């Protein structure tokens, strides 16, 4: 069958955590840690505030949002870890903004389209299609499944 | 050699290597990945026991948010690609925890310098290639290090 805001999802998380690159860079300069704690619950509580609307629930804005954030977190350590092949942090942020906007806006019709029966199948032919669109490395790829966690569960929740 | 830190990737690479078969499991149980409640409880036990391993309990959260997240992104990629006994295996863990939170402190002392992210990284490569670890088990050791020359400084 076909998923096609599930892949809208998927496509919309893979442009932002293609951003963790830039936002490591920034970091390996400014000697800014990869995790702010107070900061990125500020920013869970204000995207779950806009969960009504768009027609979706607060816990299952914070979840995804919260899956978002590791997958750029994990991309970010791993890169901070190795040799850098060596940035506007207003310009990512403005990016980060305009993408977290359309995954709100994509999101419930993609946790539709996953209260079905065989969610984790279409979820992982959805995944494998995205990294081979966006030919993503194995890195990016492991942040792509991170970035969506549980949705399968997610979906049932409301 | 910086040999407490590398003890204590040593003990993140064990309990990485672990979540294969946690991720086994949920497969055949259809369990969620992540469970917030039981989370948090683990990271309230272990924060609140800080003290008496000669640590914060800020830095003990920070470490095991970390070793969580790290055993949460290998269970994600396994189970989106191509039995077990979980009582066992979640035993195991617990007896990491404890290694862990025992060789914190000394770790975090060999990470106050003033060329932290190199010997953080050196220790992080020397023990992929001692353990063999993959490339999805290398991130994953790299994310359970977390900001670790930061923690240090708390």
Aim: glycine share 4%; charged share 25%.
């Amino acid at each position: 069958p076909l998923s096609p805001a599930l892949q809208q999802l998927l496509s919309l998380s893979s442009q932002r955590l293609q951003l963790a690159d830039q936002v490591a860079q920034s970091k390996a300069q400014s000697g800014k840690a990869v995790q702010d704690s107070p900061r990125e619950e500020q920013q869970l509580q204000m995207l779950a505030g806009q969960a009504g609307s768009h027609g979706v629930g607060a816990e299952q804005v914070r979840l995804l949002f919260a899956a978002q954030i590791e997958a750029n977190k994990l991309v970010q350590y791993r890169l901070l870890s190795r040799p850098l092949p060596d940035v506007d942090l207003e310009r990512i942020r403005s990016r980060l903004n305009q993408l977290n906007l359309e995954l709100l806006r994509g999101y419930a019709p993609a946790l539709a389209e996953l209260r079905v029966d065989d969610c984790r199948p279409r979820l992982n032919q959805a995944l494998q299609r995205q990294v081979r669109v966006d030919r993503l490395d194995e890195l990016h790829a492991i942040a792509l499944s991170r970035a969506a966690g549980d949705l399968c569960h997610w979906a049932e929740l409301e």
